[PDB]
Design a protein around this nucleic acid. Sequence first.
DNA 1: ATATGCTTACCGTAACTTGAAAGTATTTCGATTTCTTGGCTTTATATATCTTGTGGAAAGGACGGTGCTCGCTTCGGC
Length: 98
Amino acid sequence: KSLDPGLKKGYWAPEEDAKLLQAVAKYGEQDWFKIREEVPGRSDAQCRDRYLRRLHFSLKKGRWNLKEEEQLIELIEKYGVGHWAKIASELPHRSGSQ
DNA sequence: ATATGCTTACCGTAACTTGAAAGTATTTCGATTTCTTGGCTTTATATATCTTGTGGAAAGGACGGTGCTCGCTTCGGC
């Protein structure tokens, strides 16, 4: 993903809405190397996490209400700290980076 | 006018992945070993009889420096 003349380091999504989302109907969540052969300027390593953090549905999002602190408590009560410990390996999509 | 809001380029280790070099068992080709028969070596008087191979004969062909002065011949003299 470095020293490559064919990659693009942009911030927005120019044509990504069509180049990257078609794979949702084309390929599964495996063998991402088939995607980079058709989408120029994008590498599979960043594309995986982009697809993940963009097309996920089950996330703790919204405004901080009077019922979310209990959610945080029961989240940090499942196995422990969760952010950086090994217990993050079994947390479903609850990665530490978020 | 600026800090945390989420978003994503990318430099933190890790394992199940594609296929060429290196160690491993296995049957097959070929070389080795071990059986078999059968003569080698002693003897026995027998003795057959017919050929082989020899041998001392007969008898042959086969190859086994330099004067020096008597005397020998040939013409050759008148």
